[PDB]
Enzyme design. Structure first.
Site, PDB file in Angstrom:
ATOM      1  N   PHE A  30      23.618  85.559  41.623  1.00 57.06           N
ATOM      2  CA  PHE A  30      23.488  86.165  40.305  1.00 57.06           C
ATOM      3  C   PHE A  30      24.487  85.541  39.335  1.00 57.06           C
ATOM      4  O   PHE A  30      24.107  84.707  38.504  1.00 57.06           O
ATOM      5  CB  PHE A  30      23.625  87.690  40.419  1.00 57.06           C
ATOM      6  CG  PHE A  30      23.529  88.435  39.115  1.00 57.06           C
ATOM      7  CD1 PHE A  30      22.996  87.863  37.972  1.00 57.06           C
ATOM      8  CD2 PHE A  30      23.995  89.730  39.047  1.00 57.06           C
ATOM      9  CE1 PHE A  30      22.940  88.573  36.783  1.00 57.06           C
ATOM     10  CE2 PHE A  30      23.939  90.442  37.870  1.00 57.06           C
ATOM     11  CZ  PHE A  30      23.408  89.862  36.734  1.00 57.06           C
ATOM     12  N   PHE A  37      30.406  86.008  31.747  1.00 50.94           N
ATOM     13  CA  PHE A  37      29.926  85.636  33.061  1.00 50.94           C
ATOM     14  C   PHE A  37      29.326  84.243  33.029  1.00 50.94           C
ATOM     15  O   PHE A  37      28.861  83.753  31.995  1.00 50.94           O
ATOM     16  CB  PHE A  37      28.949  86.658  33.673  1.00 50.94           C
ATOM     17  CG  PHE A  37      27.711  86.918  32.857  1.00 50.94           C
ATOM     18  CD1 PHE A  37      27.749  87.762  31.761  1.00 50.94           C
ATOM     19  CD2 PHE A  37      26.498  86.356  33.209  1.00 50.94           C
ATOM     20  CE1 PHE A  37      26.602  88.025  31.019  1.00 50.94           C
ATOM     21  CE2 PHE A  37      25.346  86.627  32.481  1.00 50.94           C
ATOM     22  CZ  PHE A  37      25.399  87.466  31.393  1.00 50.94           C
TER      23      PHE A  37
END
Ligand SMILES: CCN1Cc2cc(NC(=O)c3cnc4cc(=O)[nH]n4c3C)ccc2NCCC1=O
Length: 164
Positions: A59, A112
């Site tokens: 992810f 992220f």
């Protein structure tokens, strides 16, 4: 031109290497400038010494909470939050750099790096750059994550700054 910035990352106190990021100031200047200045530390605070505290294999790797070191904190150079600048850049694949948030218009400092295409985040998180070099470092970081996001090694941005 667009800034290049770097993150030098340790795992359990030993260096993994350097992640170099291009910040797409041509598309998202306000978001790029926030990240750039947090890398240099020139406002008196920033990413140096902070951690990748939430890492989920297949992810993304999330970092940037330099105030509380756990996902509840961080702040922008503008204030505690700033608006979603646009959603023009998409979460196209591994290496995308995007802002974490707590809903619309809650960008601070947390960010992220994707390790897969995360298309469902398009229109929800502001993408503002991508990995130029150091995906091997990102894959190492990713390998120290877990389904819950809790890391199995202490992943620290020991140094960071602007290359150009
Ligand atoms: C909360 C107050 N706050 C800070 C803030 C928090 C987050 N938090 C996250 O994205 C996050 C962090 N860690 C974890 C672990 C986990 O399992 N999930 N998780 C999530 C979903 C994102 C952006 C901002 N910046 C704007 C300012 C603001 O309102």
């Amino acid at each position: 031109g667009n800034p290049l910035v770097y993150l030098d990352v340790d795992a359990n106190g030993k260096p993994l290497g350097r992640v170099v990021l291009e910040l797409k100031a041509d598309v998202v200047p306000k978001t790029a400038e926030n990240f750039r200045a947090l890398c240099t530390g020139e406002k008196g605070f920033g990413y140096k010494g902070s951690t990748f505290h939430r890492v989920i294999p297949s992810f993304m790797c999330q970092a940037g909470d330099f105030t509380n070191h756990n996902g509840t904190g961080g702040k922008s150079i503008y204030g505690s939050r700033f608006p979603d600048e646009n959603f023009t850049l998409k979460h196209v694949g591994p290496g995308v750099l995007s802002m974490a948030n707590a809903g619309p218009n809650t960008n601070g400092s947390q960010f992220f790096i994707c390790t897969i295409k995360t298309d469902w985040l398009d229109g929800k998180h502001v993408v503002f750059g991508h990995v130029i070099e150091g995906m091997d470092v990102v894959k190492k970081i990713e390998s120290f994550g877990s389904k819950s996001g809790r890391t199995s090694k202490k992943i620290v941005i020991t140094d960071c700054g602007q290359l150009s």
